[PDB]
Design a protein around this motif. Structure first.
Motif, PDB file in Angstrom:
ATOM      1  N   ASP A  58       0.889  -1.277   0.031  1.00  0.00           N
ATOM      2  CA  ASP A  58      -0.048  -0.280  -0.033  1.00  0.00           C
ATOM      3  C   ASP A  58       0.756   1.245  -0.130  1.00  0.00           C
ATOM      4  O   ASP A  58       0.660   2.126  -0.643  1.00  0.00           O
ATOM      5  CB  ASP A  58      -0.995   0.005   1.208  1.00  0.00           C
ATOM      6  N   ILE A  59       2.082   1.222   0.945  1.00  0.00           N
ATOM      7  CA  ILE A  59       2.933   2.100   0.848  1.00  0.00           C
ATOM      8  C   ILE A  59       3.645   2.311  -0.308  1.00  0.00           C
ATOM      9  O   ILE A  59       3.591   3.573  -1.041  1.00  0.00           O
ATOM     10  CB  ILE A  59       3.885   2.216   2.104  1.00  0.00           C
ATOM     11  N   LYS A  60       4.051   1.313  -1.028  1.00  0.00           N
ATOM     12  CA  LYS A  60       4.900   1.339  -2.432  1.00  0.00           C
ATOM     13  C   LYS A  60       4.206   1.766  -3.179  1.00  0.00           C
ATOM     14  O   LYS A  60       4.425   2.875  -3.983  1.00  0.00           O
ATOM     15  CB  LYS A  60       5.331   0.041  -2.509  1.00  0.00           C
ATOM     16  N   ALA A  61       2.744   1.531  -3.306  1.00  0.00           N
ATOM     17  CA  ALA A  61       1.712   1.932  -4.326  1.00  0.00           C
ATOM     18  C   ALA A  61       1.542   3.299  -4.268  1.00  0.00           C
ATOM     19  O   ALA A  61       1.339   4.124  -5.210  1.00  0.00           O
ATOM     20  CB  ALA A  61       0.519   1.131  -4.311  1.00  0.00           C
ATOM     21  N   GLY A  62       1.153   3.824  -2.812  1.00  0.00           N
ATOM     22  CA  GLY A  62       0.650   5.071  -2.960  1.00  0.00           C
ATOM     23  C   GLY A  62       1.937   6.097  -2.507  1.00  0.00           C
ATOM     24  O   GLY A  62       1.540   7.534  -2.959  1.00  0.00           O
ATOM     25  N   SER A  63       3.073   5.749  -2.097  1.00  0.00           N
ATOM     26  CA  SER A  63       4.147   6.771  -1.975  1.00  0.00           C
ATOM     27  C   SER A  63       5.148   6.855  -3.170  1.00  0.00           C
ATOM     28  O   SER A  63       6.288   7.399  -3.170  1.00  0.00           O
ATOM     29  CB  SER A  63       4.865   6.399  -0.773  1.00  0.00           C
ATOM     30  N   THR A  64       4.716   6.061  -4.468  1.00  0.00           N
ATOM     31  CA  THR A  64       5.726   6.331  -5.352  1.00  0.00           C
ATOM     32  C   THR A  64       5.632   7.590  -6.232  1.00  0.00           C
ATOM     33  O   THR A  64       4.401   8.178  -5.890  1.00  0.00           O
ATOM     34  CB  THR A  64       5.271   4.991  -6.566  1.00  0.00           C
ATOM     35  N   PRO A  65       6.739   8.530  -6.404  1.00  0.00           N
ATOM     36  CA  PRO A  65       6.790   9.543  -7.017  1.00  0.00           C
ATOM     37  C   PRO A  65       5.709  10.121  -7.742  1.00  0.00           C
ATOM     38  O   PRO A  65       5.076  11.301  -7.263  1.00  0.00           O
ATOM     39  CB  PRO A  65       8.140   9.625  -7.718  1.00  0.00           C
ATOM     40  N   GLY A  66       5.073   9.704  -8.762  1.00  0.00           N
ATOM     41  CA  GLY A  66       4.200  10.117  -9.471  1.00  0.00           C
ATOM     42  C   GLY A  66       3.040   9.534  -9.368  1.00  0.00           C
ATOM     43  O   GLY A  66       1.840   9.323 -10.393  1.00  0.00           O
TER      44      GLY A  66
END
Ligand code: HEM
Ligand code: HEM
Length: 190
Positions: A46-54
């Motif tokens: 969830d964090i990787k998905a939501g916190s990705t740069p764009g």
């Protein structure tokens, strides 16, 4: 499942905020030691998905202190990382007797009049959570972090709890004092 052994080599950048074994220093940094593997893995995606740069708005969980940090890790890497922290033993904190009493009441009884359930059904009597179901261990977590999550769920700032929106509906009946009493009690829960 994941290889904890492999996972402990993929956590260098994490230690500054979460501690080497996941027993966080700063109150605002969530402890990860002894947390359930399924929950950890879930938050990592969830964090990787939501916190990705764009990243698109409302997707995953955005953690700005972790922007683009999980992007080069594969899902197997995340599994090893979750297996690594999950195998660490958690530290217990202190519950202030002044607040603990109202926190315990809210934790065990919820607010029937509001139709807010107790927390024990999903987070277990002693806050150890339900790993197989993916209900997070709560006991011993830093109060400031717990208070923030509860507030976020309530204000709708955290939305990775699904279509049932289990935590947003529970948190919506909590007051600031409730949250303060709860976060304090959960910190000494073990
Ligand atoms: C390093 C690659 C790394 C990992 C792994 C990691 C994991 C992680 C998880 C599992 C969460 C959620 C915990 C929970 O839901 O109970 C989470 C959340 C936060 N993190 Fe983290 N984290 C890693 C690294 C770092 C670093 C280097 C920092 C500090 C600069 C950091 C900070 C935080 C913050 C803040 C949160 C909580 C955010 C919030 O909800 O307010 N992370 N981390
Ligand atoms: C009872 C009033 C109550 C509390 C307190 C509580 C807290 C809580 C926190 C602080 C979290 C986040 C933990 C973390 O970030 O590490 C959280 C998350 C989930 N909860 Fe909860 N919770 C309370 C009650 C309930 C009830 C009644 C249920 C089950 C029906 C439940 C379940 C869950 C789930 C699922 C999560 C995970 C959300 C996700 O991101 O996957 N909670 N809870």
């Amino acid at each position: 499942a994941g290889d904890a052994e492999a996972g402990q080599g993929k956590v260098a950048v994490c230690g500054a905020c979460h501690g080497v074994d996941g027993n966080s220093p700063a109150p605002n940094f969530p402890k990860l030691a002894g947390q359930g593997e399924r929950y950890l893995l879930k938050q990592l995606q969830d964090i990787k998905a939501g916190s990705t740069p764009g990243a698109p708005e409302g997707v995953g969980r955005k953690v700005l202190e972790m922007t683009g940090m999980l992007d080069p890790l594969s899902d197997q890497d995340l599994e090893d990382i979750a297996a690594y922290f999950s195998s660490q033993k958690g530290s217990v904190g202190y519950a202030d007797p002044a607040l603990a009493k109202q926190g315990e009441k809210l934790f065990r009884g919820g607010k029937l009049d509001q139709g807010m359930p107790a927390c024990t059904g999903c987070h277990a009597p002693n806050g150890v959570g339900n790993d197989l179901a993916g209900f997070p261990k709560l006991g011993g977590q830093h109060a400031a972090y717990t208070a923030k999550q509860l507030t976020d769920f309530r204000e709708g700032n955290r939305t990775n709890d699904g279509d049932t929106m289990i935590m947003r509906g529970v948190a919506a009946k909590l007051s600031n004092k409730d949250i303060e009493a709860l976060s304090s009690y959960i910190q000494g829960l073990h």
